[PDB]
Design an enzyme around this catalytic site. Structure first.
Site, PDB file in Angstrom:
ATOM      1  N   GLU A 148       0.825  -1.203   0.000  1.00 44.90           N
ATOM      2  CA  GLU A 148       0.000   0.000   0.000  1.00 44.90           C
ATOM      3  C   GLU A 148       0.861   1.256   0.000  1.00 44.90           C
ATOM      4  O   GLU A 148       0.522   2.252  -0.652  1.00 44.90           O
ATOM      5  CB  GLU A 148      -0.939  -0.008   1.206  1.00 44.90           C
TER       6      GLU A 148
ATOM      7  N   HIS B  23     -14.844 -11.748 -11.439  1.00 45.20           N
ATOM      8  CA  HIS B  23     -14.441 -10.789 -12.462  1.00 45.20           C
ATOM      9  C   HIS B  23     -15.205 -10.971 -13.767  1.00 45.20           C
ATOM     10  O   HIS B  23     -15.306 -10.019 -14.549  1.00 45.20           O
ATOM     11  CB  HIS B  23     -12.939 -10.904 -12.717  1.00 45.20           C
TER      12      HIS B  23
HETATM   13 ZN   LIG Z   1      -2.527  -3.437  -4.820  1.00 42.63          ZN
END
Ligand SMILES: [Zn+2]
Ligand SMILES: *[C@@H]1O[C@H](CO)[C@@H](O)[C@H](O)[C@H]1NC(C)=O
Ligand SMILES: *[C@@H]1O[C@H](CO)[C@@H](O)[C@H](O)[C@H]1NC(C)=O
Ligand SMILES: *[C@@H]1O[C@H](CO)[C@@H](O)[C@H](O)[C@H]1NC(C)=O
Ligand SMILES: *[C@@H]1O[C@H](CO)[C@@H](O)[C@H](O)[C@H]1NC(C)=O
Ligand SMILES: [Cl-]
Ligand SMILES: [Cl-]
Ligand SMILES: [Zn+2]
EC number: 3.4.17.23
Lengths: 595, 98, 595
Positions: free
Chosen positions: C357, C487
């Site tokens: 992150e 997805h």
């Molecule tokens: Zn990521």
């Protein structure tokens, strides 16, 4: 020294010598026009032949440059305008044949005279008498017979000449690396070598068709209205849903519908705005009219006329002792010499024509600082548009009442406005379809899409389809109606009157925005608008040193032709016609004919 | 403010660059197109002034910065603009430099 | 003023207004995520609808530019990203139908629950329970029945919806001057208008096939090894030379083989490198982990996090009184506001996720000086690759022992290295064939090369041929296995996980060369490598203002995708597998099936 330096030196020498010789030739031609005498005729003749021979030898010397290594767009354009071989590309035999064909065409059209069955010695030629009839005659049979006989007499004799002229011009232009003579004509609007402003010859036809697609509705409604109004003047001859005859358009060829105002007048009770009597009461003359036009032009922000203009220009007929051509003419003799030849009378028509000529002279003076080969308008239509915008802005009631011609105790109304708009549409938008169809037919003939055994058939079919004008009687293929027109038989381009008619409104709508107009476009006046005057002068100054698209962008802001201003001009007239064009079916049926 | 301080406005479009120390309060519609627009906000006719909307959560690059320019130049009339001139003490019965 | 000036002005105005409105929307969404309450929900909703309406009206206004006269590549790309009409091209009826289809697909996939014959009231949904079984259940029949029932329940209901969605998306994309929706998806990698770096949509499929041609051998050997190791855990069900069942891959769809490490562990006697207990002994916390990640990132040469990051970001769950989504998230609210939302626990997984992150936030800050329409990664795969390279470099033993987590009295050996490499291959290279075959099947379906009556047949054949996974039982054509994936049913592109998986190793191998590495690629650490950090920042700074190929050239030196770094990463593991993959025949026979 690269080829560029040689080209620059040659162009400078040519500029000098051609300026001198062209001034000489223009002076001789002016002396001839202002005084028709054998001595002045000889002066014009020798000056003209010497100038033409100089130009031809210079072009022959100019062809020695490949023109592909040069990069200066100015020198490139100058050479292109000077390196064009022209008619000398064909062998001498074809040259002599084409010259003889053109000469005999022009003479037969001019010396054409029609004998009539009314009396063995009552023949009348075209310009006088025949036009008087075609304009003011209200009898069906008379004008019908005249319109039929003129064609049957002129076109039937010109057809064997046109059959030769078409093929000769096709073989001439094709030798010049063109597709046909119709494409050679379209080369005027050709712009190349400058990305972002380029313009090919083929795009002209597509753009013209696109503009006519938008011109059609207004013209359809105008034709419907004219037809509905002609039923009462020519009963038992016109159809409710059919096309209109060709001999009821007001002229020999129907190019202009000005002669139909006397029959299709919306409100004939109130006379049109005429300041003729108001001028003689104030003791007006040509000098005063031209000085008023000068004050109007300088008020917009343009320079004042040259001192030699008021001294050398002949603005009034001296009588039939110094005989001259009474046609309104703008004379740019060169080297700072500008004159206007016009038999100015005390009439509103003369006022508007003087304004037009003064605007033309202003345009000519704008690009006076450019080379000789570039001392011309952007194209064949920009000059006439710049000249007509002035006459349009000057004919407005506000301008006539601001200078003292119209009495202040008179406020315009909707009736007179509609009358003026319709009378203007009779000549501005009423002639656009005629020019468009004529040019399209000529292009298709030059390209060969119309075989020799389908000339008149295709001509009449295109007429019926586009202009909505039907043939009065059956016409054999030996006829030649297109050749009956001056511009067709005299080898003159006709698309200029369309592109120019559109550029007129493109400029009018482009200058009204600068003057902060607040009403309809037909009431705009560019007077006292310095910003509009400067915006216009910034384009007139360029002349031909820049592409016509770039010049159009300077004033109108658009790179390509646009017709929306034309429709906006006649938008109130369009709404009035739509409100009035509901008593009968709008449109025409091409299958119907009066025979 | 947590909700955004939209009281600070700044000019984003102008016909030409301003001169040194020039002040322009004009709020006329900037003509970005070809027609004047008749003074109405629409396509190709944008309002010149734009808001900031400062918030406490903005980054150092976008946080508000109060800037000032005290600015000092030369002419004729003598001036009262002159720094404080300080002082010392008063001694007596001894020759010193006054 | 040319169209370029109008475009620039419009783009500046849009940049300002969209920056403001997008900051507002991101702030509302952050307030919602960090605190699930009806008020924050309403704030997110109204902010989102206003931002979307603003974007739509701006795109409508942006379509007024032809985009062919413009030459500035930056303005061109901004307009292309803003002028895309999208779903509004189709009529409103098709729009409503497609929206309803998407909504019902997503809800049926989310609200899907399978009833079982074990008890009339023992239904379990997908995320909890079913995944637990599919991951840890060692019973053949249990996981087989679960894998079959989930599909038979979800795909059979989604098939009538997919039959509509496929054709609707095909008619939508085709209206956008595309070939199909599969081609519309590939438009992300489209590069045009820049010679030397251009990239067409069609080249993506060819390049992907070329890279898979080289990925195949390593995956073939890995599959052979996994099969040879599964024979002991699932005897009487697996073939020596045949494919593997679909319910023995460790997950509902077999996308990742992480759950197979417990069964295919090369050397289970030695535990993997885990620093979990070593962190609690030193009293570590989220703050310390994030500050260590900061020190690591700045050591490479990247800027330090914003002050607002440590102040506004929520890095630890405050408990079940301020409820928030526990998913690791990077928040770029805009205007210099960056935050990370993550329920950071004391675990190595949380350490790697925090590193990921922080790398994502660093990337986001890199191109912060670019326009709003260009404040994004080079493509859909560059961001995740840049985020994963950091977690890769941080998980190395040298980095763990340099910061004090790993004890210095421990030197890595070949056994643990092979274990770690194989466990990484279970998720990196083990999922590449799945993604590749899924994307190829979706592309062929969108293009129409697979008829409607051959969807599942072609799907299963491609599975057997590429991934080597056979179907456990006969499947009727009413089934829909692809729709069972998140997805696929949620209309999300899946090729990003392949191109990104390759870009990961392309960058890893490109940065190791700058750090002067001297060992295998899996032991590289970009820590204290200023040159590698600067080389990476020179590309992250570009963002989307330049083609993705040029960005790839800045770091890796290659204009096109390359998979050789991927094979080089697992080269020791490849050699170990080759040395071990000789007890049985390597490969699989697609003709064999368990039924
Ligand atoms: Zn990521
Ligand atoms: C083009 O010709 C004009 C007139 O001779 C000259 O002023 C200009 O410098 C030339 N440009 C070039 C670069 O040849
Ligand atoms: C132009 O200015 C003159 C003098 O002020 C004025 O008499 C005339 O009415 C004006 N013309 C128009 C219509 O702008
Ligand atoms: C392209 O846009 C950039 C950024 O606005 C500007 O700096 C540059 O002058 C533009 N170039 C062209 C050719 O318009
Ligand atoms: C980076 O430098 C730090 C500071 O001396 C050191 O502790 C660490 O070992 C270095 N990291 C690596 C693995 O290069
Ligand atoms: Cl005719
Ligand atoms: Cl599946
Ligand atoms: Zn004229």
């Amino acid at each position: 020294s690269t080829i560029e330096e040689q080209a620059k030196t040659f162009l400078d020498k040519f500029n000098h010598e051609a300026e001198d010789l062209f001034y000489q030739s223009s002076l001789a031609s002016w002396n001839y026009n202002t005084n028709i005498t054998e001595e002045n005729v000889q002066n014009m003749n020798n000056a003209g032949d010497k100038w033409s021979a100089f130009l031809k030898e210079q072009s022959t010397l100019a062809q020695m440059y490949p023109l592909q290594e040069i990069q200066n767009l100015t020198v490139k354009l100058q050479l292109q305008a000077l390196q064009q071989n022209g008619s000398s590309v064909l062998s001498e035999d074809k040259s002599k044949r084409l010259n003889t064909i053109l000469n005999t065409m022009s003479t037969i059209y001019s010396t054409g005279k029609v004998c009539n069955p009314d009396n063995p010695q009552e023949c009348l030629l075209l310009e006088p008498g025949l036009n008087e009839i075609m304009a003011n005659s209200l009898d069906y049979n008379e004008r019908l017979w005249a319109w039929e006989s003129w064609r049957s007499e002129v076109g039937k004799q010109l057809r064997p000449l046109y059959e030769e002229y078409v093929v000769l011009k096709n073989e001439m232009a094709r030798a010049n690396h063109y597709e046909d003579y119709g494409d050679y004509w379209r080369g005027d609007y050709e712009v190349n070598g400058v990305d972002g402003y380029d313009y090919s010859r083929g795009q002209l036809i597509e753009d013209v068709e696109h503009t006519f697609e938008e011109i059609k509705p207004l013209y359809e409604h105008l034709h419907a209205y004219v037809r509905a109004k002609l039923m009462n003047a020519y009963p038992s001859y016109i159809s409710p849903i059919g096309c209109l005859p060709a001999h009821l358009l007001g002229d020999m060829w129907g190019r202009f519908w000005t002669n139909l105002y006397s029959l299709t007048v919306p409100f004939g009770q109130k006379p049109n705005i005429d300041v003729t009597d108001a001028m003689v009461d104030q003791a007006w003359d040509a000098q005063r009219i031209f000085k008023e036009a000068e004050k109007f032009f300088v008020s917009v922000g343009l320079p004042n006329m040259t001192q030699g203009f008021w001294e050398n220009s002949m603005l009034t007929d001296p009588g039939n002792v110094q005989k001259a051509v009474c046609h309104p003419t703008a004379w740019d003799l060169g080297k700072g010499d500008f004159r206007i030849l016009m038999c100015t009378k005390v009439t509103m028509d003369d006022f508007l024509t003087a304004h037009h000529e003064m605007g033309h002279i202003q345009y000519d003076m704008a690009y006076a600082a450019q080379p000789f080969l570039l001392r011309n308008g952007a194209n064949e239509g920009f000059h006439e548009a710049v000249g007509e915008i002035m006459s349009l802005s000057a004919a407005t009631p506000k301008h006539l009442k601001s200078i003292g011609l119209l009495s202040p105790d008179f406020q315009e109304d909707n009736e007179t406005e509609i009358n003026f708009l319709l009378k203007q549409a009779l000549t501005i938008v009423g002639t656009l379809p005629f020019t468009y169809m004529l040019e399209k037919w000529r292009w298709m003939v030059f390209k060969g899409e119309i075989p020799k055994d389908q000339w008149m058939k295709k001509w009449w079919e295109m007429k019926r389809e586009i202009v909505g004008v039907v043939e009065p009687v059956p016409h054999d293929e030996t006829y030649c109606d297109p050749a009956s027109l001056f511009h067709v038989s005299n080898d003159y381009s006709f698309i200029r009157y369309y592109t120019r008619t559109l550029y007129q409104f493109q400029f009018q709508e482009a200058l009204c925005q600068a003057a902060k107009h607040e009403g309809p476009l037909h009431k705009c006046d560019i007077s006292n608008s310095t910003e509009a005057g400067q915006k216009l002068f910034n384009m007139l100054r360029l002349g031909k040193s820049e592409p016509w698209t770039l010049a159009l962008e300077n004033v109108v802001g658009a790179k390509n032709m646009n017709v929306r201003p034309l429709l906006n001009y006649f938008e109130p007239l369009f709404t009035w016609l739509k409100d009035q064009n509901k008593n009968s079916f709008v449109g025409w049926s091409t299958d119907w004919s009066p025979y | 403010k947590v909700g955004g301080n939209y009281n600070y406005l700044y000019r984003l479009f102008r016909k030409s660059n301003l001169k040194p120390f020039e002040r322009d309060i004009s709020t006329e519609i900037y003509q970005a197109g070809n027609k004047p627009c008749n003074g109405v906000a629409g396509f190709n006719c944008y309002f010149p002034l734009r808001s900031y909307g400062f918030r406490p959560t903005y980054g150092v690059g976008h946080q508000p910065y109060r800037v000032v320019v005290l600015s000092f130049e030369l002419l004729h009339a003598p001036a009262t603009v002159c720094g404080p001139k300080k002082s010392t003490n008063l001694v007596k019965n001894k020759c010193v430099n006054f």
